[PDB]
Amino acid sequence: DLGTENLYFQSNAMTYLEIEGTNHLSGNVTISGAKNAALPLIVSSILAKNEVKINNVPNVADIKTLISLLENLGAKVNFQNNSALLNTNTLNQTIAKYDIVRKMRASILTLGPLLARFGHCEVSLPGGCAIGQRPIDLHLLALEKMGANIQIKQGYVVASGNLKGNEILFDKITVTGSENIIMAAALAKGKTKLLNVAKEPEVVQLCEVLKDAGLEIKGIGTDELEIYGSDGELLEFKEFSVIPDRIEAGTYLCAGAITNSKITLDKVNATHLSAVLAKLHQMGFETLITEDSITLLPAKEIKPVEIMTSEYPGFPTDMQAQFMALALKANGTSIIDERLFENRFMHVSELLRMGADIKLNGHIATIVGGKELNAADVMATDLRASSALILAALAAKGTSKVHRIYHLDRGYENLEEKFKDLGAKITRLEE
Amino acid sequence: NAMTYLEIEGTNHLSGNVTISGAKNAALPLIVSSILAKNEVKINNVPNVADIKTLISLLENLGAKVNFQNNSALLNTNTLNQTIAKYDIVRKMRASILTLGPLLARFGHCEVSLPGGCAIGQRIDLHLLALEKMGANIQIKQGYVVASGNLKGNEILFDKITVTGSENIIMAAALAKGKTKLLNVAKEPEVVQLCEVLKDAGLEIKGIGTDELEIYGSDGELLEFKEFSVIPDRIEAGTYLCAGAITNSKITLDKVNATHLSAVLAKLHQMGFETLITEDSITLLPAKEIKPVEIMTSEYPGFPTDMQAQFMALALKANGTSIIDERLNRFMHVSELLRMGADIKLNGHIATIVGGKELNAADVMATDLRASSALILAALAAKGTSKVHRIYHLDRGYENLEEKFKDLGAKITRLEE
Numbered sequence: 130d131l132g133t134e135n136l137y138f139q140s141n142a143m144t145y146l147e148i149e150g151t152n153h154l155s156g157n158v159t160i161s162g163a164k165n166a167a168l169p170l171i172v173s174s175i176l177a178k179n180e181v182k183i184n185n186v187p188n189v190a191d192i193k194t195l196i197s198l199l200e201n202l203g204a205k206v207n208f209q210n211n212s213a214l215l216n217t218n219t220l221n222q223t224i225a226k227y228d229i230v231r232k233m234r235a236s237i238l239t240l241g242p243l244l245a246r247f248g249h250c251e252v253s254l255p256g257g258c259a260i261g262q263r264p265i266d267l268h269l270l271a272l273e274k275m276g277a278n279i280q281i282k283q284g285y286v287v288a289s290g291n292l293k294g295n296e297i298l299f300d301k302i303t304v305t306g307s308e309n310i311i312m313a314a315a316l317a318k319g320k321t322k323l324l325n326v327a328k329e330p331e332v333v334q335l336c337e338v339l340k341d342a343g344l345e346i347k348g349i350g351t352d353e354l355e356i357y358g359s360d361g362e363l364l365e366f367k368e369f370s371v372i373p374d375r376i377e378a379g380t381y382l383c384a385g386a387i388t389n390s391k392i393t394l395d396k397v398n399a400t401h402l403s404a405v406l407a408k409l410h411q412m413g414f415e416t417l418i419t420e421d422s423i424t425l426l427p428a429k430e431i432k433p434v435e436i437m438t439s440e441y442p443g444f445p446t447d448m449q450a451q452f453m454a455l456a457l458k459a460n461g462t463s464i465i466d467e468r469l470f471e472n473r474f475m476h477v478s479e480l481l482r483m484g485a486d487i488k489l490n491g492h493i494a495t496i497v498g499g500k501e502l503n504a505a506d507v508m509a510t511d512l513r514a515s516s517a518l519i520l521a522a523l524a525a526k527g528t529s530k531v532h533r534i535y536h537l538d539r540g541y542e543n544l545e546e547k548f549k550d551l552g553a554k555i556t557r558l559e560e
Numbered sequence: 561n562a563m564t565y566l567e568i569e570g571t572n573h574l575s576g577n578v579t580i581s582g583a584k585n586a587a588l589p590l591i592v593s594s595i596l597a598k599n600e601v602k603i604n605n606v607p608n609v610a611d612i613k614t615l616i617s618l619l620e621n622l623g624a625k626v627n628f629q630n631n632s633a634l635l636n637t638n639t640l641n642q643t644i645a646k647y648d649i650v651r652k653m654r655a656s657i658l659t660l661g662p663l664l665a666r667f668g669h670c671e672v673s674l675p676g677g678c679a680i681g682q683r684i685d686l687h688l689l690a691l692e693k694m695g696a697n698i699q700i701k702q703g704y705v706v707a708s709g710n711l712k713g714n715e716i717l718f719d720k721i722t723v724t725g726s727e728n729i730i731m732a733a734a735l736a737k738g739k740t741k742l743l744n745v746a747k748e749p750e751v752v753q754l755c756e757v758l759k760d761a762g763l764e765i766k767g768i769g770t771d772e773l774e775i776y777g778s779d780g781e782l783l784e785f786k787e788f789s790v791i792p793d794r795i796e797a798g799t800y801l802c803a804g805a806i807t808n809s810k811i812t813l814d815k816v817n818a819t820h821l822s823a824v825l826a827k828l829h830q831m832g833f834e835t836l837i838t839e840d841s842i843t844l845l846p847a848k849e850i851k852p853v854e855i856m857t858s859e860y861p862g863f864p865t866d867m868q869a870q871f872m873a874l875a876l877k878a879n880g881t882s883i884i885d886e887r888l889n890r891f892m893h894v895s896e897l898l899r900m901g902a903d904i905k906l907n908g909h910i911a912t913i914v915g916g917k918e919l920n921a922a923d924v925m926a927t928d929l930r931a932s933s934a935l936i937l938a939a940l941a942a943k944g945t946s947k948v949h950r951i952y953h954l955d956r957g958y959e960n961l962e963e964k965f966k967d968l969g970a971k972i973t974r975l976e977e
């Protein structure tokens with residue numbers, strides 16, 4: 130999911146965003162291709178005997194890193210105008226100790242395809258693996274069910290053996306684990322049956338592409354897949370476009386709502402935002418869909434909302450912060466119920482400095498909307514929190530300053546240009 | 561000194577007493593807290609496990625004079641010198657980040673290795689943001705944290721309930737300049753003991769046991785510690801209770817605090833097992849029929865996620881359908897129970913157990929401590945002789961685990977793999 134280290138804290142070379150508030154918005158914003166779909170779709174070219182064409186690919190750091198890793202392993206690549214060309218005919222793995230760190234982070238997606246196609250694969254134990262403990266993120270248990278022999282012998286995890294189909298149960302709903310095992314099953318011998326499979330549109334596209342490429346797969350879109358493996362034979366890929374970034378789209382919608390403004394989104398799929406559109410409706414905003422486009426209409430009054438995060442197709446945790454920001458304008462008390470898994474409320478402290486009335490009680494945030502928000506100097510954290518602070522700034526009185534935008538820039542390309550075209554008064558300055 | 565495994569015969573019935581050890585998760589922060597003591601600190605009822613020894617040895621490497629025998633430790637950090645703590649025994653230790661707070665606060669800077677911990681993908685760490693709010697300058701070069709600056713009191717909000725974050729910031733606030741206010745603080749008994757010890761040692765602290773603490777920092781002045789015993793290990797206790805329940809047997813636990821297991825005792829009651837408390841001891845009585853249970857994990861004092869697996873194992877003997885609702889892995893033990901004939905179905909984050917079916921013995925691979933506990937329990941109730949491999953997480957969590965089950969009557973034996 131993430132392609133580099135904790136460079137967030139390195140604030141010697143850095144920039145920040147200055148945003149003036151209380152400006153009505155207007156116009157159109159084109160939604161980019163989903164970063165989380167593109168990553169597994171690029172890793173999937175490991176399964177293609179021919180040239181793979183992929184369109185609507187966001188030009189972000191993680192995409193570039195992945196492409197460069199495949200080049201280092203022999204793949205012939207090209208990437209321009211959000212379109213990539215992949216050919217893994219010459220792909221070969223390198224000696225366990227070559228591109229060490231790059232291969233360790235990408236192993237959550239590449240481990241499966243590489244072990245399946247090439248019969249073996251080595252990944253380095255991260256720092257923090259006490260004698261014995263194997264990485265639980267890799268789905269090592271899953272691959273063992275498919276006949277893989279796994280061992281820890283020189284500071285690395287060494288997987289080997291020919292993969293065969295089997296019934297595999299996911300201990301928890303995992304987007305990357307699903308994608309990693311879907312690609313392993315694709316080349317294994319015989320039929321694989323996956324249970325408790327993530328239903329996210331990103332997983333669905335992966336399956337659709339493989340199906341379109343000749344693989345027998347049933348249950349697409351459900352939590353239970355049946356895959357008839359090609360028994361080592363690579364597939365004939367066909368050109369396709371990466372799906373629109375539903376989170377990015379959700380965030381532009383909240384920008385239109387929090388400023389209580391008419392705006393329109395292009396190159397967007399409403400079917401992937403069901404839960405989000407329903408909540409915007411619960412808050413008084415009418416939605417209007419015309420295939421690849423969505424238009425948001427202002428509300429008479431912004432009404433409070435109750436949100437509980439869950440796995441797709443429920444309300445996405447990746448939109449929780451943007452809705453907390455919008456709930457600040459609602460005429461009444463809102464409630465947001467989150468999962469105690471990876472902070473998730475990093476944006477709260479910074480909103481308090483903008484005069485927000487927010488109280489945390491364990492995993493549940495109570496928002497008392499109505500107060501006028503005041504501008505402030507805020508420190509952004511993850512992508513999620515970063516989106517929320519920009520939204521709050523657009524509705525607050527005065528000029529705000531959003532610092533530490535490292536996670537935001539690695540998540541979205543031309544972010545200023547899009548807000549600028551919608552009429553927002555945003556400018557980047559040197560820290 | 562190679563890998564070993566456990567061979568367990570499906571027991572018909574247990575009986576006797578089991579003494580509960582001191583909580584490893586309390587002991588770790590309490591040992592790190594001697595960094596805040598100007599004199600000798602005495603700590604009793606300390607479990608003899610790998611993480612305890614490693615931590616003691618880390619403090620020795622930094623200058624502290626130490627000793628550890630018969631579950632009792634002596635700590636004196638009068639000679640604690642440098643705050644450079646970047647070794648590999650420390651890198652692998654998950655609880656080592658607990659030292660960052662005390663060392664930065666007392667000495668003005670420190671270097672510690674990022675724990676990580678087998679995960680490929682990592683977090684922004686919540687400890688680091690918290691210390692920045694207290695004026696600290698943080699930087700990451702290589703896989704180490706370089707912290708510096710003088711700490712000052714401030715109002716700090718925890719983005720999520722975190723046991724170690726709380727402990728780490730409670731110790732930092734203790735020596736910082738001025739008043740600190742902590743919000744959304746974990747209420748676990750482990751955090752509570754830390755606060756009690758510091759209060760007893762002369763620190764002005766209010767709200768102990770609640771989710772909101774108020775700390776008046778001693779502005780660099782160290783505290784006078786008083787001798788104490790680490791609290792009993794509530795998870796270990798919960799696990800011996802499930803052993804007694806899954807074998808539907810009368811057993812008793814000693815050196816245990818029932819107040820720290822209220823949610824767990826309530827569920828055992830919901831399943832037909834009578835509980836009987838007498839001072840520091842609990843006695844479990846068999847049920848006429850084991851009844852199904854509905855469990856939802858939550859923050860203390862609710863049902864602990866650290867007992868969820870042991871209850872899934874017990875639900876296999878219940879006459880009916882049970883439900884366990886978890887936080888999004890936490891169900892790594894499910895696959896191995898299926899090979900013992902269990903009827904368990906996962907639907908996202910909710911497991912449905914259809915108890916009643918007879919469990920059969922099997923050759924299983926344990927994973928984390930949680931899963932490891934569950935497999936031993938299932939083995940005791942299954943028919944035949946099971947074999948539980950990969951017990952490295954179990955041995956680092958409990959000492960003389962065989963000896964305790966043996967004394968309760970279980971047929972368990974350790975063999976070389």
Ligand SMILES: [Cl-]
Pocket residue numbers: 765766767768
């Ligand atoms: Cl108090």
